[PDB]
Every structure is written in C-alpha cells, then in structure tokens.
C-alpha cells in the first residue's frame, strides 16, 4: 500500500532519461 | 430411464456403492500426495451432470469402441474431469489406490442381476436371523 509504490516511477524516470532504444520509452509511458 | 440397457466400450458410466448410497463420481478431490501429483476420487453423492462419470476404454487391442462388454473382459477406466486412469500405486511399502496417468487393468465379475431376484428366496450375502419352528 505504501511500502515501495512511489519508487517505481523513479526507476522509470531514470530509464526514460537515457533510453537508447526507440519503441521502449513509448511502452514505459 | 430405459430399463436394463447393455454396456459398451467408450460409454460414460456411473457407479454406486451397494449398501451405502455414495455415488463414486467426478468430485473435486485434491488431497492425496503420495506420488506428489495424483488424485483419489473417493465417495460422495454430488451427481451433478458433467462431473458425474467415469469412462471405459478397452484393455488391449482385442475389442474396440462400440462393442458390447462381455463377462471377464479386463478394462481401463478414466474420469471426465481429471482424465486420470484408475491408477494402482504403492504409497509406502504397501498398496495405495490413486488416480494417475499410468493406467492399470481392472477386471469385473458377476454378482447378481434383476432377473436373479429373491421374492422370498435366498441369495448369498443376505443377512438373516435364525428361528426354531416351535420355540422361535
């Protein structure tokens, strides 16, 4: 409920910054 | 029903224990773990259409489907729900009946019928209480 919900968005953010492959950030959105 | 129909291979059968009315039938038995993947469909009276039956298949290639079962013909039995055969395993240094995929032969034998009726006459297996004619 409130253990580690919010940090997944930080993970997806850090992936989205340096996301080399196309059509990969589009599915992370 | 129909009344004393015959029995054919491939038919969907229903059994019933004689003295207790617990129809041996397709039930949600998910308990035994001797083999660690096998069932034992025990006794319970839930004759509920689809989950009701077993099904015959012949033992070896001498009689095919559609044929009438004769006396003494060894058989194979299988559920409709689990599809396991009537497995004969060995649990722990002893016998243990289960339902699995390793099939096993299963003979039958006659005991009685409807024409073989008492109507006061004696039949084996019958309980009774003995009586003197004078002293009772």
């Amino acid at each position: 409920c409130g253990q580690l919900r919010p940090s997944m968005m930080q993970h997806l953010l850090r992936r989205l910054v340096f996301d080399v492959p196309l059509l990969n950030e589009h599915a992370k959105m | 029903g129909g009344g004393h129909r015959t029995l054919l291979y491939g038919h969907a059968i229903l059994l019933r224990h004689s003295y207790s009315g617990m129809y041996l039938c397709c039930l949600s038995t998910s308990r035994s773990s001797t083999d660690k993947l096998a069932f034992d469909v025990g006794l319970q009276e839930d004759t509920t259409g689809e989950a009701c039956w077993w099904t015959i298949h012949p033992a070896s290639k001498q009689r095919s489907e559609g044929e009438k079962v004769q006396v003494g013909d060894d058989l194979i039995l299988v559920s409709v729900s689990s599809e396991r055969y009537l497995h004969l395993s060995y649990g722990n240094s002893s016998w243990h009946v289960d339902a699995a995929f390793q099939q096993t032969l299963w003979s039958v034998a006659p005991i009685s019928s409807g024409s073989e009726a008492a109507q006061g006459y004696l039949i084996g297996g019958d309980v009774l209480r003995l009586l003197h004619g004078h002293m009772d």
């Binding site: - | 660690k36 993947l37 096998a38 995929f101």
Partner: protein, 48 residues
Amino acid sequence: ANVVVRLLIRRPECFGPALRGEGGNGLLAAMEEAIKIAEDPSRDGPSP
C-alpha cells in the same frame, strides 16, 4: 493445445535432477541445483 497437453501428460518425462515421483517436474529445485553447475564451473559440473 488440448491434444498436446493430453499427449504430454501420459509421458511427462522431463526428469530433472531429483524430486518426488518423477525425476524433476519442479523448477526451483532443478534450477538452483544447476546454477551450482553453471555459476562457478563451466557448462559441466566438473569443469574449470
């Protein structure tokens, strides 16, 4: 798929290293057993 499952199930002979009834037929046991073969040694168990 129905016939494939019905045919696999008569002879589910995916006999892994050691489990009950069958050889394997269970994933975490065989996988953790084989990672010992894989991680330190080569593809083989005894290999450098």
